Design a protein around this ligand. Structure first.
Ligand SMILES: [Cl-]
Ligand SMILES: [Cl-]
Ligand SMILES: [Cl-]
Ligand SMILES: [Mg+2]
Ligand SMILES: [Mg+2]
Lengths: 203, 206
């Protein structure tokens, strides 16, 4: 019945929060992490530097913070509506799977691809590696999935909010800029300026 | 709808990605020492990988790609892929190695996918750093799980082929576990062993 692919960004798309930040202030280093943005932004260095600010953070805490992010309204509703229309629903995140694994199960996403916060003796050791370590990581994984599930660009829908989602926007027919930054809105097929994911259903 | 997953180093290609590069760059003994120890409980897979890659610093990317695209396939390679696809098998490759190589073979054998690690590049030369998907010895297993859930394919319909201990992770979630000219440790949890450097020998099992 026609197989389709839907990919969601995580931070500020599914959850009305930025994982690395909620993590930062939970450990009391938000004011430092907030300023770590190296640059035409270097996503890789910025990310690994912020993560290091988390050295020694106990895992139970990090896991608690990551599994408690607030979702945007319509989240579940949107995802169920997509699945009932033969959509494979996936989530891409420059964030971490402590977060993405939880929401993948909660929203019944078919898959989630993010990075891992390396743990040593029950605490974060400040290191990170994974699927989304570079700024063009989403576009790449999208091509991977399309070739894997054998779904075309024409049958792909993408939803994100930041500059980082551009690499994903390139290989999609439907591009939704959800409460997005100027750069992303300007390449979108549709813009949603209201904090409710259900608004996307009419699509 | 079935799933067939292949290990890369010493399973699809009769070579070990990391050392071919090490020697091609002249840091073979250093890497060799480290490859050992790792196989002999001294250091975990993760630190090994990171340490062995640092020995590749400054290596031209073009030369690195060239070496990675020159690895000798195992005889019967294309045969099996072709055979598997007829039996409605989604052919995928897992590697604790690098996509610079697995991406080439992925495209050559037209595999549906290939999941590896990445060699960071700075000013057209290897950085000495690596990051990615398969950086831990339990990585392959965890990825197989993600795959099974994504495609909605059961373990019963999963066929795995590997040669090393690192492959025990994806063995634990497979019905058909194949040890291709493997180490005894993998042979132990195996379901079929192939002690012949010929990959078409798996066809009778598919
Ligand atoms: Cl992101
Ligand atoms: Cl980057
Ligand atoms: Cl490996
Ligand atoms: Mg975002
Ligand atoms: Mg091997």
């Amino acid at each position: 019945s026609l197989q389709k692919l839907a990919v969601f960004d995580f931070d500020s798309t599914l959850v009305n929060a930025e994982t690395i930040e909620s993590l930062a202030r939970a450990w009391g280093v938000f004011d430092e992490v907030k300023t770590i943005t190296l640059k035409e932004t270097d996503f890789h260095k910025s990310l690994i530097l912020r993560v290091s600010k988390l050295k020694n953070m106990p895992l139970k805490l990090a896991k608690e913070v990551c599994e408690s992010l607030p979702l945007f309204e319509g989240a579940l509703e949107l995802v169920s509506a997509l699945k009932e229309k033969n959509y494979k629903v996936v989530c891409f995140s420059g964030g971490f799977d402590l977060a993405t694994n939880h929401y993948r199960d909660l929203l019944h996403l078919d898959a989630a691809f993010s990075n891992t916060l390396i743990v040593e003796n029950d605490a974060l050791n400040g290191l990170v590696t994974g699927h989304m370590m570079f700024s063009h990581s989403k576009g790449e994984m999208l091509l991977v999935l399309q070739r894997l599930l054998n779904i075309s660009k024409t049958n792909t829908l993408v939803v994100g909010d930041g500059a980082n989602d551009l690499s994903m926007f390139k290989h999609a027919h439907i591009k939704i800029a959800f409460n997005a930054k100027e750069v992303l809105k300007q390449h979108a097929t549709h813009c949603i300026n209201e904090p409710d994911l259900a608004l996307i259903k009419p699509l």
